[PDB]
Amino acid sequence: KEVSEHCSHMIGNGHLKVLQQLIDSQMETSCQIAFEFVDQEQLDDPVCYLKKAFFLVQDIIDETMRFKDNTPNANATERLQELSNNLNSCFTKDYENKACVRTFHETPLQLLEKIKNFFNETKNLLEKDWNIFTKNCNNSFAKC
Amino acid sequence: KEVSEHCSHMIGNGHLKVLQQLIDSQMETSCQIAFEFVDQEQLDDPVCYLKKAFFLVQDIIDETMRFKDNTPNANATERLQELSNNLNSCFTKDYENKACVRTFHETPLQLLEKIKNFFNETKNLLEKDWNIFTKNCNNSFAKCS
Ligand SMILES: [Ca+2]
Ligand SMILES: [Ca+2]
Ligand SMILES: [Ca+2]
Ligand SMILES: [Ca+2]
């Protein structure tokens, strides 16, 4: 059914810039961190891909993007943490729950890229059709 | 036997400021990197500790502190790298090389705290006696096992 129309403009360019500045400041290291994310090999559908990613992105924002309190980046994460909560109103639940997901071991920088790409693709789609993520993904998911 | 009196002010609060910022912008994680640094246990002499650290900090700044070009942190690291070179003339060379050196498996922020700590202390001892790092540390290094 219908969802909030606000979802159409939930994600602004201010959110993506804040996200890039955050990325830019990060130091390139060999150290890899472990995190759960969507396995593309088993889930291609662009809509259902982002639909499944949104919930993993949320966890990552809360439980991995840690910055020293009151720093410019910490504030970025504040804004992103809030944005993520508002977006709950734009993603309907699908019947499953741990399939389509794999363990990723990659650089913190390569991770912050995935989050970026998510908020970007998600932004575009929502502009085009702010009911897009009400899609039924039971099958797409089940094909994993 | 002596170094330019200007070693006194070669390190400025400006250098420490850009460094603290660089540090504050780094995402806290438990990802651990491996690097060589001074083993405090085998080398606790304040002066000689820093002399040994200097070259090690040189290496780290050059090969480990990597940022995307023209980035605020990439520009700070450039300044520090320059400072590192100009500081070389303030440290007299000692004779001995892997004495007092140990591998550390720690997070980047911890590794940076070592870099910041190095500059702070080094800055202080130069403000008190700009010839301090002329000291002969052959014996302190030799004590290491
Ligand atoms: Ca797994
Ligand atoms: Ca379906
Ligand atoms: Ca004079
Ligand atoms: Ca000066």
Report the CATH number at residue A12: 1.20.1250.10
Nearest listed ligand to the Cα of residue B8? 4
- Contact A32/B28, CB-based, under 8 Å? no
Query: How far is B103 from chain A, CA to nearest CA, in Å?
Result: 16
Query: How far is A108 from chain B, CA to nearest CA, in Å?
Result: 8
Residue A36 half-sphere exposure toward CB, CA atoms < 13 A: 12
**Inter-residue contact B121 to B32 (CB < 8 Å):** no
Residues of chain B in contact with residue A32, where contact means CB-CB under 8 angstroms, are 31
**Inter-residue contact B11 to B126 (CB < 8 Å):** yes
- Contact A67/B28, CB-based, under 8 Å? yes
List residues of A whose CB lies inside 8 A of any B CB.
24-33, 64-68, 71-73, 108, 112
Name the closest residue on chain B to residue A21, using Cα atoms. B71
**Inter-residue contact B43 to B100 (CB < 8 Å):** yes
Please compute Rg for chain B using Cα positions: 15
Number of structural domains chain A divides into: 1
Name the closest residue on chain B to residue A74, using Cα atoms. B25
Dihedral, CA atoms, B129, B134, B135, B139, nearest 10 degrees?
A: 160
Report residue A99 as tokens: 């399939």
- Contact B29/A108, CB-based, under 8 Å? yes
DSSP A3-69: --GGGGGSS-HHHHHHHHHHHHHSPP-S--EEEEEE-GGG---HHHHHHHHHHHHHHHHHHT-B--T
Residue B124 half-sphere exposure toward CB, CA atoms < 13 A: 8
Experimental resolution (Å):
2.8
- Contact A31/B29, CB-based, under 8 Å? yes
**Non-local CB neighbours of A139 within 8 Å, separated by 6+ positions:** none
CA of A139 relative to ligand 2 center, distance in Å: 4
**Non-local CB neighbours of A57 within 8 Å, separated by 6+ positions:** A84, A115, A118, A119
Q: Write down the residue that tokens 């977006």 correspond to.
A: A87
Q: How was this structure determined?
A: X-ray
Chain-centroid distance, C-alpha B80: 10
Name the closest residue on chain B to residue A28, using Cα atoms. B66
Name the closest residue on chain B to residue A33, using Cα atoms. B31
**Rounded to the nearest 5°, which phi and psi values hold at A23?**
-60, -50
Strand partners, A101: A38
Query: Containing domain of residue B141, as a range?
Result: 1-145
CA separation for the pair B114, B127 (Å, rounded): 20
CA of B95 relative to ligand 3 center, distance in Å: 30
